RNA sequence: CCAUAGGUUAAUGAGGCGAACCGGGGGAACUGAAACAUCUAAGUACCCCGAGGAAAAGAAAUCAACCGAGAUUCCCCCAG
RNA sequence: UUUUGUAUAAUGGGUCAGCGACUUAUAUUCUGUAGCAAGGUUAACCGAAUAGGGGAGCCGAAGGGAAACCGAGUCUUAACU
RNA sequence: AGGACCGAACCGACUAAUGUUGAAAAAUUAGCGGAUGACUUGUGGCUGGGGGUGAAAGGCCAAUCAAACCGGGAGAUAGCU
RNA sequence: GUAACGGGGCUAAACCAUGCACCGAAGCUGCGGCAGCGACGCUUAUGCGUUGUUGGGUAGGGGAGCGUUCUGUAAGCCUG
RNA sequence: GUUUAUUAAAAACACAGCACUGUGCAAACACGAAAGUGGACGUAUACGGUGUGACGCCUGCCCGGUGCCGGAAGGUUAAUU
RNA sequence: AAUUCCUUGUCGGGUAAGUUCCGACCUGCACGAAUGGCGUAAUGAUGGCCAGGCUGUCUCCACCCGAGACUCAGUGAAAUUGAACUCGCUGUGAAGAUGCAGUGUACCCGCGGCAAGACGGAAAGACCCCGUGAACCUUUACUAUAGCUUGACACUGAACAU
RNA sequence: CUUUAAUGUUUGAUGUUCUAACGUUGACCCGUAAUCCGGGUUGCGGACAGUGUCUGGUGGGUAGUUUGACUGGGGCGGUCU
RNA sequence: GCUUGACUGCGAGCGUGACGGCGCGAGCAGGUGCGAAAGCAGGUCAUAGUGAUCCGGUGGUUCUGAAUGGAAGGGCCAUC
């Protein structure tokens, strides 16, 4: 049968041009006020998936 | 922790606000500060409000 | 017992030594209190972290009445 | 062809090592298992919508 | 009291068996979730009823999207 | 066989013969190889039928952004050297 | 008269020896308790598995019982050997 | 059961200090053989006085093979 | 008297007796999706449940906790509107 | 004390000597009144203790009668078993050696016996621990649920009085 | 607007009296050779009881499960950022 | 004494982590405060004062709006 994508990972990672995956930074949901503005500002932009986790992401996302 | 978080709402009506904390035992008077408003790109007076 | 506690080591110390070429903004040493003081072309962070304000070679020197240790960057 | 004698180089274990999950019949953890922690695709928050 | 229930005849028909497939009435747990309740397993196993050579479904109070298509069933896509 | 470590007084086997354990399907990624090549390839099905037809689709040649959108740029921001 | 007494059949099974791949997957030998009773026994019948039945030990329910046996789910699962 | 030189035995066959020998390993060196790899000389998918060097091995990774049954080759070939 | 058939026959269980409590008979209760049946073709001098366990002398104090019974004014409170 | 930890409590009786028994004492670690208290004739394959009789239970075993064991003939198993050309000692060593080192001893092979060893045989240890094992059972563990109970609506209507 | 006196209305709260739903494991008749059932007559009860949906309370009666790890074995103690 | 830089958008280059992440940062843009100015200020001498994701709540937003116009809901920003 067709492989089923892990739907939780498909809603958080988008494939990029050179095969990478972008995700939003964590730690920015509901305890952010006590965090310095500089810390919050750096978490706002999108980030690249680290090399260690590339294999796990590709396994969860076989069709994308 | 007994200090409670508050929000400072801009008077310009943009709806932007900052958040901070204040001691409720002392300093009952409302907090007024001049802070930068990103919507109007100017430093305006921010007024204390209730987080909800 | 009521002991057996510690915190993870914060990896302080000298990261770039004398004569090393560094890029602007690279931190040379992380410390607790001003063990080293900022000299020419060297900035001081809010936690007394000394960082390079220009490209060049790291040089350590001792000057002043207090016999203190200073870090400067010779930007060629 | 593993497990077909000493000379084959894959005998008596079939390349699976010694008594792990990979050595059990039908053994092995599911995709995204991080040893017990919630995996990275669950530590991180969801974002966006599909148009 | 008529009636009705009931009773006695006479005609037809049905009874049971049989592999799977089919429709319907009921309907688990082990297991997976590295535990476990929602969930999964699964409307599966099993039980029951009924029918046929097929059954079921079926001739739009259906879809489309401002263009149109024109009952149902089945296959490949759409698409993990 | 299991172990840091077994002549070990740790497990296994009385012996022989026969049998006895990494397979299969689908999908996906990588390598090798062959073909074609900015293109490649069809599935069901049709078909005297391993041919041929069928390009329905799928992947690739363009990305950025949550998205609308823009596009060799794009997002972020009022704007970015 | 008696859930009276002594004591065979009958029924029980307290002690000891033997037997422990037995004559016997619970018995034999010598003693022992009850022996007109809440006794014992024959032939039929009824109660069915989360149920039965139990003068109650988790006992018994076909040499199996803190949940019988048979088939099915089923190649349950087994981070263990 | 001697059992605290392995034993015999030793007054040096012990210890100390100098020497010169010898024994001693699958180490090293000779004389052959096989294989992997590196840069060369010509030639190089082949290979050549090549040369230098390497070749203990579990888990495990890589590479190259043997043999068994069956299909084509094969209405061929082997065989009273 | 009964009990762990097959290592325990006992001080364990049962027992007559005693007390509490439920039950007015389409009884309580129990087995049953239900019908029904048992209780019982019985009727509180009866039946069920619980604890104690002949007989003799006796069974003292605590209703705060937890249950049960009685009360219903007030507080709180579901479906519904 | 079926209850007493300290404990063989203390005293008395029984004995030559009694951690048991019997009688008291009370200091009841931690008895107690129908989860009954205390007594109680009779009963008991009931528990403990004592005395007489009686005896091979014993001092201390002896003999004898039978059935096996032993020999012969016939029939003819079993558990177990890596392979054995299967000695002692001391030391070493997966840390208790028939198998290693050293050394001593020992002609080859049966039969009747004894069980010290072969960590002898039996049965993937019941104790201990572990597994995000199983099962039963308990409860003011969690979530439910049968049952019981409450009300609204329906089956279900009329009239009158407040 | 308050205070509201009366006025009809619309919903409820009880109490009383009916019968016609419903109940009858009261009597009698028939089906009928019948302690079932059904029908009829009559009496009693009666808008209750009882049942359905929804709903609050109760509920080891019965289920499905949970009940951590480190640790000079484990538990207990301590610890977990 | 005067004040709100306990500023908004960003950030060359580094540090420390398996990762999630955490930390340091000159400089740039817009607006500020204190100084006459050079200049300093992106909280506190520094290192503890803390909690991921999911789900739900609040405000903002021409991002989306299942035929169309809205809307619900979702997204983004701020935040519980
Ligand atoms: Mg190998
Ligand atoms: Mg193994
Ligand atoms: Mg392994
Ligand atoms: Mg599970
Ligand atoms: Mg036919
Ligand atoms: Mg052995
Ligand atoms: Mg064996
Ligand atoms: Mg290829
Ligand atoms: Mg074709
Ligand atoms: Mg096309
Ligand atoms: Mg760009
Ligand atoms: Mg008698
Ligand atoms: Mg007798
Ligand atoms: Mg014996
Ligand atoms: Mg008697
Ligand atoms: Mg049995
Ligand atoms: Mg069971
Ligand atoms: Mg079975
Ligand atoms: Mg199954
Ligand atoms: Mg199995
Ligand atoms: Mg060599
Ligand atoms: Mg053939
Ligand atoms: Mg017995
Ligand atoms: Mg018996
Ligand atoms: Mg017995
Ligand atoms: Mg009793
Ligand atoms: Mg009370
Ligand atoms: Mg009271
Ligand atoms: Mg004692
Ligand atoms: Mg005495
Ligand atoms: Mg006494
Ligand atoms: Mg007592
Ligand atoms: Mg009392
Ligand atoms: Mg009492
Ligand atoms: Mg008796
Ligand atoms: Mg006695
Ligand atoms: Mg005597
Ligand atoms: Mg031997
Ligand atoms: Mg020995
Ligand atoms: Mg020894
Ligand atoms: Mg012998
Ligand atoms: Mg012997
Ligand atoms: Mg013996
Ligand atoms: Mg555990
Ligand atoms: Mg339970
Ligand atoms: Mg389960
Ligand atoms: Mg533990
Ligand atoms: Mg719509």
Coordinates of N, CA and C (backbone and C1' of nucleotides) in Angstrom, one line a residue, chain F residues 22-67:
Chain F
rC22 P 15.9 -17.2 6.2 O5' 15.7 -15.7 5.8 C5' 14.4 -15.1 5.5 C4' 14.5 -13.6 5.5 C3' 15.6 -13.1 4.6 O3' 15.2 -11.9 4.0 C1' 15.8 -12.3 6.9
rU23 P 15.4 -11.6 2.4 O5' 14.2 -12.3 1.8 C5' 14.1 -13.7 1.4 C4' 12.7 -14.2 1.3 C3' 11.7 -13.4 0.6 O3' 11.8 -13.6 -0.8 C1' 10.8 -14.0 2.7
rU24 P 11.6 -12.4 -1.9 O5' 10.0 -12.1 -1.8 C5' 9.1 -13.1 -2.3 C4' 7.7 -12.7 -2.0 C3' 7.3 -11.4 -2.4 O3' 7.0 -11.3 -3.8 C1' 6.6 -11.7 -0.2
rA25 P 7.3 -10.0 -4.7 O5' 6.0 -9.1 -4.3 C5' 4.7 -9.5 -4.6 C4' 3.7 -8.6 -4.0 C3' 3.9 -7.1 -4.2 O3' 3.4 -6.7 -5.4 C1' 3.4 -7.5 -1.9
rU26 P 4.2 -5.6 -6.3 O5' 3.8 -4.2 -5.6 C5' 2.5 -3.7 -5.6 C4' 2.2 -2.7 -4.5 C3' 3.1 -1.4 -4.6 O3' 2.6 -0.5 -5.5 C1' 3.1 -2.3 -2.3
rA27 P 3.7 0.4 -6.3 O5' 4.1 1.5 -5.2 C5' 3.2 2.5 -4.8 C4' 3.7 3.1 -3.5 C3' 5.0 3.9 -3.6 O3' 4.9 5.2 -4.1 C1' 5.0 2.5 -1.7
rU28 P 6.1 5.8 -5.0 O5' 7.2 6.2 -3.9 C5' 7.0 7.2 -3.0 C4' 8.0 7.2 -1.9 C3' 9.4 7.4 -2.3 O3' 9.8 8.7 -2.6 C1' 9.3 5.6 -0.8
rU29 P 10.8 9.1 -3.8 O5' 12.3 9.0 -3.1 C5' 12.7 9.8 -2.1 C4' 13.8 9.3 -1.3 C3' 15.1 9.0 -2.0 O3' 15.9 10.1 -2.3 C1' 14.5 7.2 -0.6
rC30 P 16.7 10.2 -3.6 O5' 18.0 9.3 -3.3 C5' 18.9 9.6 -2.3 C4' 19.9 8.5 -2.0 C3' 20.6 7.9 -3.2 O3' 21.8 8.7 -3.6 C1' 19.7 6.1 -2.0
rU31 P 22.3 8.7 -5.1 O5' 23.0 7.3 -5.3 C5' 24.2 7.0 -4.6 C4' 24.6 5.6 -4.8 C3' 24.8 5.1 -6.2 O3' 26.1 5.5 -6.7 C1' 23.5 3.5 -5.0
rG32 P 26.2 5.8 -8.3 O5' 26.2 4.4 -9.0 C5' 27.1 3.4 -8.7 C4' 26.8 2.0 -9.2 C3' 26.4 2.0 -10.7 O3' 27.6 1.9 -11.5 C1' 24.8 0.8 -9.4
rU33 P 27.6 2.7 -12.9 O5' 26.6 1.9 -13.8 C5' 26.9 0.6 -14.2 C4' 25.7 -0.1 -14.8 C3' 25.1 0.7 -16.0 O3' 25.8 0.4 -17.2 C1' 23.4 0.0 -14.6
rA34 P 25.8 1.6 -18.4 O5' 24.4 1.4 -19.1 C5' 24.1 0.3 -19.8 C4' 22.7 0.2 -20.3 C3' 22.2 1.5 -21.0 O3' 22.6 1.6 -22.3 C1' 20.6 0.8 -19.3
rG35 P 22.7 3.0 -23.0 O5' 21.2 3.5 -23.3 C5' 20.4 2.7 -24.1 C4' 18.9 3.2 -24.0 C3' 18.7 4.7 -24.2 O3' 18.6 4.9 -25.6 C1' 17.5 4.0 -22.3
rC36 P 19.4 6.2 -26.2 O5' 18.4 7.4 -25.9 C5' 17.2 7.6 -26.6 C4' 16.2 8.3 -25.9 C3' 16.5 9.8 -25.6 O3' 16.2 10.6 -26.7 C1' 15.8 8.8 -23.6
rA37 P 17.2 11.8 -27.1 O5' 17.0 12.9 -26.0 C5' 15.8 13.5 -25.8 C4' 15.7 14.2 -24.4 C3' 16.7 15.3 -24.1 O3' 16.4 16.5 -24.7 C1' 16.6 13.8 -22.3
rA38 P 17.5 17.7 -24.9 O5' 17.2 18.6 -23.6 C5' 16.3 19.7 -23.7 C4' 15.0 19.4 -23.1 C3' 14.0 20.6 -23.0 O3' 12.7 20.1 -23.1 C1' 14.5 19.8 -20.8
rG39 P 12.1 19.9 -24.6 O5' 12.5 18.4 -24.9 C5' 11.7 17.3 -24.5 C4' 12.4 16.6 -23.3 C3' 11.9 15.2 -22.9 O3' 12.5 14.2 -23.7 C1' 12.0 16.5 -21.0
rG40 P 11.6 13.0 -24.2 O5' 11.5 12.1 -22.9 C5' 12.6 11.5 -22.3 C4' 12.3 10.9 -20.9 C3' 11.2 9.9 -20.9 O3' 11.6 8.6 -21.4 C1' 10.9 11.4 -19.1
rU41 P 10.6 7.8 -22.4 O5' 9.4 7.3 -21.4 C5' 9.7 6.4 -20.4 C4' 8.5 6.4 -19.4 C3' 7.2 6.0 -20.0 O3' 7.0 4.6 -20.2 C1' 6.9 7.9 -18.6
rU42 P 6.6 4.0 -21.6 O5' 5.0 4.5 -21.7 C5' 4.0 3.7 -21.1 C4' 3.6 4.3 -19.8 C3' 2.4 3.6 -19.1 O3' 2.7 2.4 -18.5 C1' 2.1 5.9 -19.0
rA43 P 1.7 1.2 -18.5 O5' 0.5 1.5 -17.5 C5' 0.8 1.6 -16.1 C4' -0.4 1.8 -15.3 C3' -1.7 1.1 -15.7 O3' -1.8 -0.2 -15.3 C1' -2.2 3.4 -15.3
rA44 P -2.4 -1.3 -16.2 O5' -3.9 -1.1 -16.1 C5' -4.6 -1.3 -14.9 C4' -6.0 -0.6 -14.9 C3' -6.9 -1.1 -16.0 O3' -7.6 -2.3 -15.7 C1' -6.9 1.3 -15.9
rC45 P -7.6 -3.5 -16.7 O5' -8.2 -3.0 -18.0 C5' -9.6 -2.6 -18.0 C4' -9.9 -1.6 -19.1 C3' -9.7 -2.2 -20.5 O3' -10.9 -2.9 -20.9 C1' -8.6 -0.1 -20.4
rC46 P -10.7 -4.2 -21.9 O5' -10.4 -3.5 -23.4 C5' -11.4 -2.7 -24.0 C4' -10.8 -2.0 -25.2 C3' -10.3 -3.0 -26.3 O3' -11.3 -3.5 -27.1 C1' -8.7 -1.2 -25.9
rG47 P -11.3 -5.1 -27.4 O5' -9.9 -5.3 -28.3 C5' -9.7 -4.6 -29.5 C4' -8.2 -4.8 -29.8 C3' -7.7 -6.2 -29.9 O3' -7.9 -6.8 -31.2 C1' -6.2 -4.8 -28.7
rA48 P -8.7 -8.2 -31.2 O5' -7.6 -9.2 -31.9 C5' -6.6 -8.6 -32.8 C4' -5.2 -9.0 -32.4 C3' -4.4 -9.6 -33.6 O3' -3.0 -9.3 -33.3 C1' -4.7 -11.3 -32.0
rA49 P -2.5 -7.8 -32.9 O5' -2.4 -7.9 -31.3 C5' -1.9 -9.1 -30.6 C4' -1.6 -8.8 -29.2 C3' -1.1 -10.0 -28.4 O3' -0.2 -9.6 -27.3 C1' -3.1 -9.2 -27.4
rU50 P 1.2 -10.3 -27.2 O5' 1.6 -10.0 -25.7 C5' 1.4 -8.7 -25.1 C4' 2.6 -8.2 -24.4 C3' 3.7 -7.7 -25.3 O3' 4.4 -6.6 -24.7 C1' 4.5 -9.5 -23.9
rA51 P 4.1 -5.1 -25.0 O5' 4.0 -5.1 -26.6 C5' 5.3 -5.1 -27.4 C4' 5.0 -5.0 -28.9 C3' 4.4 -3.7 -29.3 O3' 5.4 -2.7 -29.5 C1' 3.2 -5.4 -30.3
rG52 P 5.2 -1.2 -29.0 O5' 3.8 -0.8 -29.7 C5' 3.8 -0.5 -31.1 C4' 2.4 -0.3 -31.6 C3' 1.5 0.7 -30.9 O3' 1.8 2.0 -31.4 C1' 0.3 -1.2 -31.0
rG53 P 1.8 3.3 -30.4 O5' 0.2 3.5 -30.0 C5' -0.7 3.9 -31.0 C4' -2.1 3.6 -30.6 C3' -2.6 4.5 -29.5 O3' -3.0 5.8 -29.9 C1' -3.2 2.2 -29.0
rG54 P -2.6 7.1 -29.0 O5' -3.4 6.8 -27.6 C5' -4.8 6.9 -27.5 C4' -5.3 6.5 -26.2 C3' -4.7 7.3 -25.0 O3' -5.5 8.5 -24.7 C1' -4.5 5.0 -24.6
rG55 P -4.9 9.9 -25.2 O5' -4.3 10.5 -23.8 C5' -3.1 10.0 -23.3 C4' -2.5 10.8 -22.2 C3' -2.1 12.2 -22.6 O3' -2.2 13.1 -21.5 C1' -0.2 11.0 -21.8
rA56 P -3.6 13.8 -21.1 O5' -4.5 12.7 -20.4 C5' -5.9 12.7 -20.4 C4' -6.5 12.1 -19.2 C3' -5.9 12.6 -17.9 O3' -6.5 13.9 -17.5 C1' -6.1 10.3 -17.8
rG57 P -5.6 14.9 -16.7 O5' -5.3 14.2 -15.3 C5' -4.1 14.4 -14.6 C4' -3.6 13.2 -14.0 C3' -2.2 13.3 -13.4 O3' -2.3 13.8 -12.0 C1' -2.3 11.4 -14.8
rC58 P -1.2 14.9 -11.6 O5' 0.1 14.1 -11.3 C5' 0.1 13.0 -10.5 C4' 1.4 12.2 -10.5 C3' 2.7 13.1 -10.5 O3' 3.0 13.5 -9.2 C1' 2.8 11.5 -12.3
rC59 P 3.5 15.0 -9.0 O5' 5.1 15.0 -9.2 C5' 5.9 14.0 -8.6 C4' 7.2 13.8 -9.4 C3' 7.9 15.0 -9.8 O3' 8.7 15.6 -8.7 C1' 7.8 13.6 -11.7
rG60 P 8.8 17.2 -8.6 O5' 9.8 17.5 -9.8 C5' 11.1 17.0 -9.9 C4' 11.8 17.4 -11.2 C3' 11.7 18.9 -11.6 O3' 12.7 19.6 -10.9 C1' 11.2 17.6 -13.5
rA61 P 12.4 21.2 -10.6 O5' 12.7 21.9 -11.9 C5' 14.0 21.8 -12.5 C4' 14.0 22.4 -13.9 C3' 13.3 23.8 -14.1 O3' 14.2 24.9 -13.6 C1' 12.6 22.4 -15.8
rA62 P 13.5 26.2 -13.2 O5' 12.4 25.8 -12.1 C5' 12.7 25.5 -10.8 C4' 12.1 26.4 -9.8 C3' 10.5 26.3 -9.7 O3' 10.1 26.6 -8.4 C1' 11.2 28.5 -10.3
rG63 P 10.1 25.4 -7.3 O5' 10.7 26.2 -6.0 C5' 12.1 26.6 -6.0 C4' 12.2 28.1 -5.7 C3' 11.5 28.5 -4.4 O3' 12.3 28.2 -3.2 C1' 11.0 30.1 -6.1
rG64 P 11.6 28.0 -1.8 O5' 11.2 29.5 -1.4 C5' 12.1 30.5 -1.2 C4' 11.5 31.9 -0.9 C3' 10.4 32.0 0.1 O3' 11.0 32.1 1.4 C1' 9.7 33.1 -1.8
rG65 P 10.3 31.3 2.7 O5' 8.9 32.0 2.9 C5' 8.8 33.3 3.4 C4' 7.4 33.9 3.2 C3' 6.3 33.1 3.8 O3' 6.2 33.2 5.3 C1' 5.7 33.8 1.7
rA66 P 6.0 31.9 6.2 O5' 4.6 31.3 5.6 C5' 4.2 30.0 6.1 C4' 2.7 30.0 6.2 C3' 1.9 30.5 5.0 O3' 1.7 29.4 4.1 C1' 1.0 31.6 6.9
rA67 P 1.9 29.7 2.5 O5' 0.6 30.6 2.1 C5' -0.7 30.1 2.3 C4' -1.7 31.2 2.2 C3' -1.7 32.1 1.0 O3' -2.5 31.5 -0.1 C1' -1.7 33.4 2.9

